[PDB]
Design a protein around this ligand. Structure first.
Ligand SMILES: Nc1nc2c(ncn2[C@@H]2O[C@H](COP(=O)(O)OP(=O)(O)O)[C@@H](O)[C@H]2O)c(=O)[nH]1
Length: 304
């Protein structure tokens, strides 16, 4: 086994967790974290932790990371016992808020302290949200880098091209929750069901690496594997030059038709796009609910 815990920190972070529940992830345990008592109620997670009750009285962090920072420090023990037993902890949050920007780095440090492989999956706010949010988020990012083994950062502006253009600003973060689900699912599924690798290989590629890029490719057809890999390494989601990688993790999820030769033909594509001296590790995830559709996920770490 491997105990995989996903911890949502903040408003958007918890919205992502709900989205993961409704999507039907099962290899993972979900924790909700917020200084907002009301929004925490709306968490579909099995475990909810109110933080900083004596400091904020359950009313939200008012968009100041500093408040979120001590709120988590004040409730360290409750965080500590939630993270308990986890071989690996995902911290997912939106950067630029209060509870998220401030507390998530704390949640990450505690988890990494306890000896869990700690991966952060976060977003940069939209550009239109303003300079304050931007700066607050940049500080939020950097804080996380020092608190996690591996940080995945997804700018919301990079999703703006795949937003409908017929979308209210209320629904504007439904693509962020989606990618956050994919970010977590792509890795977690590799550990649980994946063949061809195992948890110890993932710890090697991911411990103390720093920033990581993620790319996803979906395809079906005669040479579906190659096309799916080709989409993943040319995905919009990353600043494209994965070539800087000193580590690559690959998830090829498919149906029962998915063969080894197909996997390899897709693994070769990714390897040719990265440094020749890259430590590549990849695995096969079987989802029988798929017939011909294949999903390739690459996480490039170790840079730089
Ligand atoms: N994934 C996701 N991100 C969000 C959502 N709402 C807001 N965000 C992003 O997260 C940032 C604010 O985080 P939020 O959770 O709302 O604030 P906090 O609870 O005080 O930490 C904003 O700048 C948004 O870019 C959401 O529902 N889902």
């Amino acid at each position: 086994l491997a105990t995989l815990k996903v911890i949502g920190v903040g408003g958007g972070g918890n919205n992502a967790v709900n989205r993961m529940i409704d999507h039907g992830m099962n290899n993972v345990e979900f924790i909700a974290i917020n200084t907002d008592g009301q929004a925490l109620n709306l968490s579909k997670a099995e475990s909810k932790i109110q933080i900083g009750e004596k400091l904020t009285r359950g009313l939200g962090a008012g968009a100041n990371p500093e408040i979120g920072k001590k709120a988590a420090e004040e409730s360290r023990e409750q965080i500590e016992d939630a993270i308990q037993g986890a071989d690996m902890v995902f911290v997912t949050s939106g950067m630029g808020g209060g509870t998220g920007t401030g507390a998530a780095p704390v949640v990450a440090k505690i988890a990494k302290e306890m000896g869990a492989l700690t991966v952060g999956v976060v977003t940069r706010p939209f550009s239109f949200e303003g300079r304050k949010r931007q700066t607050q988020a940049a500080a939020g990012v950097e804080a996380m880098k020092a608190a996690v083994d591996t940080l995945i950062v997804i700018p919301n502006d990079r999703l703006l091209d795949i937003v409908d253009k017929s979308t209210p600003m209320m629904e504007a973060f439904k693509e962020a929750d989606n990618v956050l689900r994919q970010g977590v699912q792509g890795i977690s599924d590799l550990i649980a069901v994946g063949a061809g690798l195992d948890f110890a290989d993932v710890k090697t590629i991911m411990s103390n690496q720093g920033s990581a890029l993620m790319g996803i490719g979906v395809s079906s057809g005669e040479n579906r594997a190659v096309e799916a890999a080709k989409k993943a390494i040319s995905s919009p989601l990353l600043e494209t030059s994965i070539v800087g990688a000193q580590g690559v993790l690959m998830n090829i999820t498919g149906g029962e038709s998915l063969s080894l030769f197909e996997a390899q033909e897709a693994a070769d594509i990714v390897q040719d796009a990265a440094d020749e001296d890259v430590n590549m590790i990849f695995g096969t995830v079987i989802n029988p609910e798929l017939q011909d559709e294949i999903v390739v996920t690459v996480i490039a770490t170790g840079f730089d």
